Design a protein around this ligand. Structure first.
Ligand SMILES: O=P(O)(O)OC[C@H]1O[C@](O)(CO)[C@@H](O)[C@@H]1O
Ligand SMILES: O=P(O)(O)OC[C@H]1O[C@](O)(CO)[C@@H](O)[C@@H]1O
Lengths: 253, 248
């Protein structure tokens, strides 16, 4: 791309991909921590990435957070009219409703002119209540759909920021801090070496399940996220990262 | 102050206040948007420093949401649905209207996530859980309610009312509906949709209630709902008001 070439993004993408061993790196100009439109541009870039990767039939698992909400906001109908079903990856993870995967999922599906199926399993159910709810045919059906996701679109967060944003019990805050968590993705907190140090108790997709998902797109940027993004990608994730100059330049510095 | 039509409607229906926009929303669809605009202005006049606003679904309150704008006074705004599922399709559900209105207001919101395809047993489990109780408690503390009014038969059909309940609604001569309750011509409850959240007895404690409903087809339904004292502000149109008052 001549735009990417003149802006130095082509080189920055190659350098970032090599540094993090990514399947691919897509970087938009600017720093989303400073300039609001940059998050929207990450959203647009992620949508392009998704459309390039869709097949004839698609089950797209999505996480919540403001970044995947920006992907949803930038989503448009498929000109090839391929079959699109959107589901949340997990149960919502203690996010307020605006930031929950169900909310992002519904928004994305409407914008894509696709269909969606939501997962309603509250995070603080008693053992007994949980046992009954997961046997419910409607819950089983959504969980089974998630098990066959062909695509995952997910955010990445700094550990402390995420622990604070969600309704994280004191007991869990202590564990997150004691084990030096630096980054978070889809209900897992990781340390600087990309090892899992704390897991949010949820339903749906688990970390081991991503290996079976052919197309995974992480969308996260802003200089504040540089260490979080680096830590997450310490492990093989077979993932395309959509990010911005803010995060990428800080990471590479 | 009030026009003679507004003054007459306020007296006739024992309203806290009447706001009547021009035209008949059953003939001129955009008039629903003008009811929405007037309702938003009314809400803004009644806000305190901190607010918990319970809202119903339906196209009229969706129009309120569409016309909502942020508060120039920057008052604290938390929106919630009044009740759980009432059997509306997604576009007409209180949860949908609630999220839309909150976004337009730059406020915050909480949703109720109840019945759906779930068993009674699984349903009861959900309503016991901490976050769900929190929303129910928030609704219980509402400082404002913004609700629609519909014709009973129309509303029963739009929702997916079981045949046995359709028969009961008909047999008891329901004529009007609001927030999941069906009322006869004397404004007495004759059938209720089962749903968590706000109950009819709870409206008395809510300081500001704004009903938004118009169109000549709703004149009978509006009159009947207000046959009992509701201490409510009605935002309506000339279509409804003139027909109700026999002034056209
Ligand atoms: O895009 P944001 O707003 O930074 O949030 C990202 C976070 O949201 C989630 O995707 C959902 O909780 C987290 O896994 C991730 O840490
Ligand atoms: O504004 P509409 O579309 O006529 O619907 C009014 C109806 O919508 C609801 O508020 C929601 O179901 C009902 O209580 C009310 O009767």
């Amino acid at each position: 791309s001549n735009a990417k070439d003149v802006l130095g993004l082509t080189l920055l993408e190659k350098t970032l991909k090599e540094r993090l061993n990514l399947k691919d790196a897509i970087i938009v100009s600017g720093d989303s921590d400073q300039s609001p439109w940059v998050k929207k541009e990450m959203g647009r870039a992620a949508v392009a990435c998704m459309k390039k990767r869709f097949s004839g039939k698609n089950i797209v698992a999505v996480t919540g957070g403001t970044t995947i909400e920006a992907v949803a906001e930038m989503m448009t109908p498929d000109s090839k009219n391929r079959e699109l079903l959107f589901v949340p990856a997990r149960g919502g993870l203690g996010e307020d409703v605006k930031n929950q995967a169900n909310t992002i999922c519904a928004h994305m599906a409407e914008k894509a002119s696709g269909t969606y199926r939501l997962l309603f399993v509250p995070g603080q159910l008693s053992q007994g209540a949980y046992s009954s709810i997961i046997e419910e045919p409607s819950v089983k059906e959504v969980l089974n759909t998630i098990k066959s996701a062909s695509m995952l679109v997910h955010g990445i967060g700094e550990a402390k920021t995420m622990a604070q944003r969600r309704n994280t019990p004191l007991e869990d805050l202590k564990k997150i801090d004691d084990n030096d968590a630096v980054t978070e993705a889809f209900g897992y907190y990781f340390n600087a070496d990309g090892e899992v140090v704390h897991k949010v108790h949820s339903v749906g997709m688990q970390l081991d399940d991503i290996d079976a998902i052919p197309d995974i797109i992480a969308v996260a940027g802003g200089s504040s996220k540089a260490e979080a993004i680096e830590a997450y990608f310490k492990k093989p994730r077979n993932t395309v990262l959509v990010t911005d100059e803010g995060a990428a330049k800080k990471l590479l510095r």
